[PDB]
Amino acid sequence: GPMNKILGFSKYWVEINNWILPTLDHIGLTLWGMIKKHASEYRGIRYSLEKFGELKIIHYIGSRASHDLGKTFIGESVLSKENNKIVKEYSWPEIKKVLRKIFLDNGISSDTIDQYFIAIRRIIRPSRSDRFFLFRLAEYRKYENPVKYDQVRDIISHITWTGRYLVPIRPEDYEAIHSRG
Incomplete structure (x- = not known):
């Protein structure tokens, strides 16, 4: 199996959006974070992707993230090896520039x-x-x-x-969340 610790091993993961945000429109386009802050989560999801090929991601919003959609699961997406052939890691200026392009191409305002x-x-x-x-x-x-x-x-x-x-x-x-709303 892996070597270092993984939070879990699963085809199904939840992304937690717990911080104040100016929008939820970017949710469902990427997963990203600082490695040393989420090391076992990153390691777990990377290893899950390798074994399952495609993961299902449910997107959760904490109470601080939205006044009306706080504490709710709002949707789901797919994390596929085909969309993620080369694992690349980034500095902060680099990933900012990649995300800004992705968000602009999806109609989010500058x-x-x-x-x-x-x-x-x-x-x-x-x-x-x-x-x-x-x-x-x-x-x-x-x-x-x-x-x-x-x-x-x-x-x-x-x-x-x-x-x-x-x-x-x-x-x-x-299935329990998917089968609701």
């Missing part, structure tokens, strides 16, 4: 993108040496009824998500 990076940078404070991971997602689709946390609180374990960005869930937890 001003909103400026606000996104200012909000993120407040929180993670990169240094010149810090490295970043990036996965390109595909097929994001918004749930027509947002799945509120209270609908599945006794099924998934939110308490274990504290301070996480990507967490594994079981196949039946995916």
Whole structure:
């Protein structure tokens, strides 16, 4: 198997968006983060992708991330090896430039993108040496009824998500959320 620690091993992962954001329009386009902050999560999802070929990602919004969609699962997407043939790692200026291009090509305004990076940078404070991971997602689709946390609180374990960005869930937890809204 792997060697260093992985948070989990699964075809189904949740992306947790817990910080204040100027928009949710970018959600479903990428997964990215600072490696040393999410090392076992990155290692787990990379190893999961290798074994499963394609992962299903459910996107979760924390209460601070939105006033109206707080604590809800809003949609899901696909993380595929075909869209992610070469794993590349990045400095902060490099990944900013890659993400800005992706977000502009998806119709997000330049001003909103400026606000996104200012909000993120407040929180993670990169240094010149810090490295970043990036996965390109595909097929994001918004749930027509947002799945509120209270609908599945006794099924998934939110308490274990504290301070996480990507967490594994079981196949039946995916089906439980997917089958709602």
